Amino acid sequence: AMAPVPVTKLVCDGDTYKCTAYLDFGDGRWVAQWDTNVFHTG
Amino acid sequence: APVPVTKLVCDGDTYKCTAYLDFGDGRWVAQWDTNVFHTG
Amino acid sequence: APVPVTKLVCDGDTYKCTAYLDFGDGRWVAQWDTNVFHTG
Numbered sequence A: 001a002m003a004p005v006p007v008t009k010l011v012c013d014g015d016t017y018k019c020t021a022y023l024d025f026g027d028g029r030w031v032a033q034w035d036t037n038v039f040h041t042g
Numbered sequence B, C: 001a002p003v004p005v006t007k008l009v010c011d012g013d014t015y016k017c018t019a020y021l022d023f024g025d026g027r028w029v030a031q032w033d034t035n036v037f038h039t040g
């Protein structure tokens, strides 16, 4: 299965509550993006 | 309980990300639904 | 606003992944629900 492609770089955003995974595919501008919780620990 | 992710992949046909875990035989994964799209 | 990840872990007891973020005092995380399982 060649469909799953590596993630080049993972970032997350506490304003939008999303993480964005840049993908090793095509022109470089495809991303995976999902909803996340974000909070300060301790 | 939390274990390191050794590798992360995402799939634009199934719309999932799969994280390979550093645990046991090396064949455990975490997997979640994701959006996938082209930016710009 | 998107910041880098310094460590990525997942947990098969709590069914979450956690990404420690490079921001502020260093204690901020992103955390989301995931499936976890052994393949094979």
Ligand SMILES: CC(=O)N[C@@H]1[C@@H](O)[C@H](O[C@@H]2O[C@H](CO)[C@@H](O[C@@H]3O[C@H](CO[C@H]4O[C@H](CO)[C@@H](O)[C@H](O)[C@@H]4O[C@@H]4O[C@H](CO)[C@@H](O)[C@H](O)[C@H]4NC(C)=O)[C@@H](O)[C@H](O)[C@@H]3O)[C@H](O)[C@H]2NC(C)=O)[C@@H](CO[C@@H]2O[C@@H](C)[C@@H](O)[C@@H](O)[C@@H]2O)O[C@H]1N=[N+]=[N-]
Binding pocket: B001, B002, B003, B021, B023, B024, B028, C010, C011, C012, C013, C014, C015, C033, C034, C035, C036, C037
């Ligand atoms: C002999 C031995 O030590 N064996 C080890 C195993 O015990 C261990 O497996 C984990 O074991 C614990 C019990 O000790 C399990 O915890 C229980 O889980 C049940 C079921 O949980 C599901 O359903 C409940 C209620 O409906 C939900 O709240 C849960 O989230 C979960 O449901 C899942 O939720 C996700 C996220 O939303 C969904 O994607 C998913 O589809 C959904 N699944 C289903 C079927 O609905 C719960 O009722 C009990 O109260 C209790 O919490 C735990 O489930 C089980 N984990 C797994 C992944 O099977 C394994 C794995 O070890 C763990 O994961 C590793 C990656 C690592 O992080 C390790 O540190 C963790 O402890 O290891 C065995 N030994 N080995 N190898």
Ligand SMILES: CCCCCC(=O)CC(=O)O
Binding pocket: B024, B025, B026
């Ligand atoms: C922690 C590794 C367990 C590996 C699972 C096996 O199938 C046994 C081996 O070949 O060693």
